[PDB]
Amino acid sequence: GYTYEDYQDTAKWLLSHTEQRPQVAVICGSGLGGLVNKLTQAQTFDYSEIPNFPEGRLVFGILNGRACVMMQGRFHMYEGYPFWKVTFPVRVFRLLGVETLVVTNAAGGLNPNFEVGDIMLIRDHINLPGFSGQNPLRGPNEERFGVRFPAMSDAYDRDMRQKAHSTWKQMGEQRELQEGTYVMLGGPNFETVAECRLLRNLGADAVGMSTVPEVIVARHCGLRVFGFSLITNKVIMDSQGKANHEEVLEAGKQAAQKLEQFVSLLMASI
Amino acid sequence: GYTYEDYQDTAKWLLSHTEQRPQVAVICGSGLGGLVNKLTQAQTFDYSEIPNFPEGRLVFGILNGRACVMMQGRFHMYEGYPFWKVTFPVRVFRLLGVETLVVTNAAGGLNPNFEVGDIMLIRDHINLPGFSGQNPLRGPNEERFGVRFPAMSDAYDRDMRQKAHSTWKQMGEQRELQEGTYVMLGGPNFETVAECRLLRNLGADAVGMSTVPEVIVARHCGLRVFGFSLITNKVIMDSQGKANHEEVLEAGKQAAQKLEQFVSLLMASI
Amino acid sequence: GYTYEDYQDTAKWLLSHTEQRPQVAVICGSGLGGLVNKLTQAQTFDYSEIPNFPEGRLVFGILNGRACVMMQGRFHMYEGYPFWKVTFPVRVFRLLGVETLVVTNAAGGLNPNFEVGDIMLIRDHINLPGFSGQNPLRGPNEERFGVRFPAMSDAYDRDMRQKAHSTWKQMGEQRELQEGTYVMLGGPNFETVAECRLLRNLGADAVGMSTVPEVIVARHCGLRVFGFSLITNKVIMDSQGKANHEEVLEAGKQAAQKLEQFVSLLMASI
Ligand code: HPA
Ligand code: HPA
Ligand code: HPA
Ligand SMILES: [Mg+2]
Ligand SMILES: [Mg+2]
Ligand SMILES: [Mg+2]
Ligand SMILES: [Zn+2]
Ligand SMILES: [Zn+2]
Ligand SMILES: [Zn+2]
């Protein structure tokens, strides 16, 4: 993996190249990267220019009177990266002094009540790769970050979920805010019909290929976490059509505007 | 992994060592290797003599007026091979100009209606190792082969399944052709009772240790896929007997003759 | 991995540094390490002094008139060790002439009928990492140890389970001996609520992060296996408290005394 020092160096480099001092880190994923704008006093860095960062920009700025750092593009295991690389940035954020992490993503809907365009607050997750030992904490533990056996049952901050449901009310949305279980699998291919039925019977509400690893690490080093998925699909019958990456579209399709205001409004609630 | 070039080289070597130009690739697995005979204008190559091939023979010839290339022996992850090695041959076939792939295997029956000696057309699969990131597509994507996020819900060609059920009718078999969900796990030990019950509740019909990876790759680079399992077992009560590799026997026990004619007859149906 | 020779060397070194010739190997895990005492003619070795051993002491002695070798501390995959390292000692034991293996551990209870302080005889297991290919037998097979495809449906010796339920009767315990399915996942974080519900619906009774690999290897080279879990937890509602490693406590809380006599009494039953 990386050593404590590597994290530190990277955090020190950041601190001396910007005056920004974020309190919140937001990780934007798969077609979610619309908030660049809305940001005030923005400063951007290419991942390539930040020492030790994995092979895509880091932007600092103020969101709604709140100092943020945003990950514009994230890392996936299906790209060939080990989880210790995918989660490297989470640890740096903690070293910058961040206290809260917002994770977001696009996912396929398993719950029949779901509709394309829906937003699902992540109340909980299912770590399939973790079932088999693929875990960002695998390996000797780093005391400076956290304990050997972190608990995960309270990962998704309850209070933030409460505020998000409140904010949405004020937004006057026509549809309700969904809430549920996100399941992570490796990708990169899309699931078969059997697979989907299986996931659904296991109690999952949405399926994707990221986020979980980042939550675990976050929770391990003490960050408060809040996350949500933008729903975009999905196939459970043997008549049909197939899943398409061109549902990056849906991420634009109406999402951006709503998502953008939602996160913005939410900033006032930390 | 291997580079595009490696595939190509291997395909070029093959093309200049044989006059055969297959349209169909068939992968024979675990005691299924009886069709060597029946083949016309046969040409065999030891995997060891073909550059870049994984550590077992490749035979070209004509089956029922159809030019084929057959993999006599396949690779398993439980042997220590990464999926990029297990699936290497699929990519070479595409580069030879193959268009259809037939995959076959031996598996333990989960569906109680199943009987030793049964043949199950694979309508769909469950990729357990894929759940955790063990996937032949893991890693940077190769555009020359296919897209980043291939769909898998229509993997098993519907039209071929229709023809196979037709051919079987004409064969006048006493028993019916089964059809169902194949689940892949890593092996090499056989499953426990708990494991089996679990697999069954997940909707699987048959369990084995191969094929899935090969399908995924196949589908990724555009081959039409058709597959089937020869059923040979399996334990779900805590009175009993245990699973034996000496059920290679069953693969002979009556299978060969039926399987052989089935595949042969099927050739006329591509 | 290790070569046959490495095992042998290690077994030879042991044999010439002690007069003890164990027949039973017991693996003590997570806060279970109380039996050091009770042992007679004890001889201890630090894992660090035994050639080839993974990075914690091996103690030989007599338990209840029975010659034993005990592993005081075991290896976990979540520590970064591959299964071939975690299971190395099992193979050495066979080479020392051991015939029976007792495995033990601490686990979280999934079965609602379970209570902290309960003892659960392991009747069967669920190998989640094995589902995905993470298996100590992965790789070329070693004939000197066992067959290529070992069966696992009769892993937990039936006769020992019968005797353990007999011994417990004589112990006059106030509560009954539980019996059930142990499920292994990688760790090191504790499970979420969703995860737990899932495991339970899959038929598991207890969940932990060890043992399974050791059983498989044991069974592969012919050892008779008996195992049990000491129950210590666990969270299935979204009111609650979280899982704590300070339930090492429970391993002391009353266990030690009972466990200690239980294993001791059991020695007379091999
Ligand atoms: O259907 C899907 N499956 C997996 N990941 C996804 N991310 C968006 N949609 C999907
Ligand atoms: O029972 C079985 N289990 C796993 N693989 C198999 N391949 C044939 N039979 C079996
Ligand atoms: O709740 C638990 N989960 C996983 N491993 C465990 N080992 C003891 N308790 C637990
Ligand atoms: Mg500036
Ligand atoms: Mg010729
Ligand atoms: Mg002595
Ligand atoms: Zn500079
Ligand atoms: Zn030549
Ligand atoms: Zn010495």
mmCIF file of N, CA, C and O and ligand atoms in Angstrom, chain C residues 30 106-109 182 185 189-191 196 207-209 230-235 243-244 247, ligand 3:
data_model
loop_
_atom_site.group_PDB
_atom_site.id
_atom_site.type_symbol
_atom_site.label_atom_id
_atom_site.label_comp_id
_atom_site.label_asym_id
_atom_site.label_seq_id
_atom_site.Cartn_x
_atom_site.Cartn_y
_atom_site.Cartn_z
ATOM 1 N N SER C 30 -9.118 -16.129 18.619
ATOM 2 C CA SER C 30 -9.643 -14.829 19.154
ATOM 3 C C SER C 30 -10.112 -14.876 20.624
ATOM 4 O O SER C 30 -11.314 -15.077 20.899
ATOM 5 N N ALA C 106 -14.309 -17.514 17.829
ATOM 6 C CA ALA C 106 -15.325 -16.628 18.392
ATOM 7 C C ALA C 106 -16.128 -16.151 17.179
ATOM 8 O O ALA C 106 -15.564 -15.981 16.119
ATOM 9 N N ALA C 107 -17.434 -15.971 17.315
ATOM 10 C CA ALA C 107 -18.214 -15.558 16.182
ATOM 11 C C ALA C 107 -19.420 -14.831 16.620
ATOM 12 O O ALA C 107 -19.858 -14.887 17.809
ATOM 13 N N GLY C 108 -19.955 -14.109 15.663
ATOM 14 C CA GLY C 108 -21.191 -13.374 15.966
ATOM 15 C C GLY C 108 -22.386 -14.275 15.676
ATOM 16 O O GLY C 108 -22.401 -15.004 14.689
ATOM 17 N N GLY C 109 -23.412 -14.267 16.548
ATOM 18 C CA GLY C 109 -24.567 -15.100 16.363
ATOM 19 C C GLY C 109 -25.587 -14.482 15.407
ATOM 20 O O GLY C 109 -25.971 -13.320 15.546
ATOM 21 N N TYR C 182 -21.564 -22.264 10.138
ATOM 22 C CA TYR C 182 -20.654 -21.145 10.303
ATOM 23 C C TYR C 182 -20.383 -20.580 8.943
ATOM 24 O O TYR C 182 -20.151 -21.322 7.974
ATOM 25 N N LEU C 185 -16.415 -14.825 6.128
ATOM 26 C CA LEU C 185 -16.271 -13.665 5.254
ATOM 27 C C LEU C 185 -14.887 -13.095 5.508
ATOM 28 O O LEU C 185 -14.256 -13.489 6.463
ATOM 29 N N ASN C 189 -13.689 -5.435 8.925
ATOM 30 C CA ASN C 189 -14.739 -4.663 9.537
ATOM 31 C C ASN C 189 -15.847 -5.573 9.833
ATOM 32 O O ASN C 189 -15.936 -6.655 9.253
ATOM 33 N N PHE C 190 -16.676 -5.105 10.716
ATOM 34 C CA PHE C 190 -17.858 -5.808 11.127
ATOM 35 C C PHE C 190 -18.940 -5.509 10.086
ATOM 36 O O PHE C 190 -18.838 -4.542 9.339
ATOM 37 N N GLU C 191 -19.964 -6.359 10.054
ATOM 38 C CA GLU C 191 -21.029 -6.311 9.087
ATOM 39 C C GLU C 191 -22.038 -5.294 9.327
ATOM 40 O O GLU C 191 -22.262 -4.903 10.455
ATOM 41 N N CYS C 196 -25.934 -8.623 7.518
ATOM 42 C CA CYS C 196 -26.338 -9.638 8.461
ATOM 43 C C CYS C 196 -27.610 -10.295 8.065
ATOM 44 O O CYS C 196 -27.733 -11.497 8.147
ATOM 45 N N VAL C 207 -21.202 -16.008 12.316
ATOM 46 C CA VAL C 207 -20.313 -15.449 11.318
ATOM 47 C C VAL C 207 -18.962 -15.102 11.937
ATOM 48 O O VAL C 207 -18.872 -14.611 13.051
ATOM 49 N N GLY C 208 -17.919 -15.380 11.206
ATOM 50 C CA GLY C 208 -16.592 -15.070 11.654
ATOM 51 C C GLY C 208 -15.664 -14.856 10.438
ATOM 52 O O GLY C 208 -16.084 -14.896 9.281
ATOM 53 N N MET C 209 -14.397 -14.641 10.738
ATOM 54 C CA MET C 209 -13.342 -14.350 9.771
ATOM 55 C C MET C 209 -12.201 -15.365 9.717
ATOM 56 O O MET C 209 -11.130 -15.011 9.194
ATOM 57 N N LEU C 230 -17.491 -19.990 19.789
ATOM 58 C CA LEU C 230 -17.973 -19.377 21.006
ATOM 59 C C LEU C 230 -18.740 -18.181 20.480
ATOM 60 O O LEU C 230 -18.148 -17.355 19.799
ATOM 61 N N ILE C 231 -20.019 -18.087 20.768
ATOM 62 C CA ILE C 231 -20.852 -16.963 20.314
ATOM 63 C C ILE C 231 -20.659 -15.667 21.174
ATOM 64 O O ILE C 231 -20.683 -15.706 22.382
ATOM 65 N N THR C 232 -20.489 -14.503 20.541
ATOM 66 C CA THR C 232 -20.317 -13.253 21.269
ATOM 67 C C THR C 232 -21.192 -12.022 20.848
ATOM 68 O O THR C 232 -20.864 -11.019 21.400
ATOM 69 N N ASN C 233 -22.264 -12.047 19.921
ATOM 70 C CA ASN C 233 -23.018 -10.805 19.545
ATOM 71 C C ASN C 233 -24.578 -10.739 19.090
ATOM 72 O O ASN C 233 -25.304 -11.321 19.819
ATOM 73 N N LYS C 234 -25.272 -10.056 18.034
ATOM 74 C CA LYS C 234 -24.978 -9.265 16.811
ATOM 75 C C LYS C 234 -26.201 -8.496 16.126
ATOM 76 O O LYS C 234 -27.314 -9.015 16.018
ATOM 77 N N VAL C 235 -25.960 -7.271 15.556
ATOM 78 C CA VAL C 235 -26.913 -6.271 14.970
ATOM 79 C C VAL C 235 -27.831 -6.449 13.764
ATOM 80 O O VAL C 235 -27.394 -6.385 12.649
ATOM 81 N N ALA C 243 -20.989 -3.511 16.984
ATOM 82 C CA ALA C 243 -20.084 -4.604 17.393
ATOM 83 C C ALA C 243 -18.718 -4.053 17.823
ATOM 84 O O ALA C 243 -18.211 -3.121 17.226
ATOM 85 N N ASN C 244 -18.134 -4.632 18.877
ATOM 86 C CA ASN C 244 -16.855 -4.208 19.443
ATOM 87 C C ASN C 244 -15.809 -5.316 19.570
ATOM 88 O O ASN C 244 -16.090 -6.413 20.011
ATOM 89 N N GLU C 247 -15.108 -7.727 23.200
ATOM 90 C CA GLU C 247 -16.017 -8.830 23.251
ATOM 91 C C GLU C 247 -15.040 -9.984 22.994
ATOM 92 O O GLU C 247 -15.229 -10.957 22.297
HETATM 93 O O1 HPA D 3 -20.157 -9.982 14.901
HETATM 94 C C1 HPA D 3 -19.144 -10.536 14.455
HETATM 95 N N1 HPA D 3 -18.891 -10.533 13.070
HETATM 96 C C2 HPA D 3 -17.771 -11.114 12.482
HETATM 97 N N2 HPA D 3 -16.817 -11.792 13.148
HETATM 98 C C3 HPA D 3 -17.106 -11.883 14.465
HETATM 99 N N3 HPA D 3 -16.335 -12.525 15.406
HETATM 100 C C4 HPA D 3 -16.989 -12.298 16.620
HETATM 101 N N4 HPA D 3 -18.074 -11.579 16.529
HETATM 102 C C5 HPA D 3 -18.169 -11.297 15.155
#
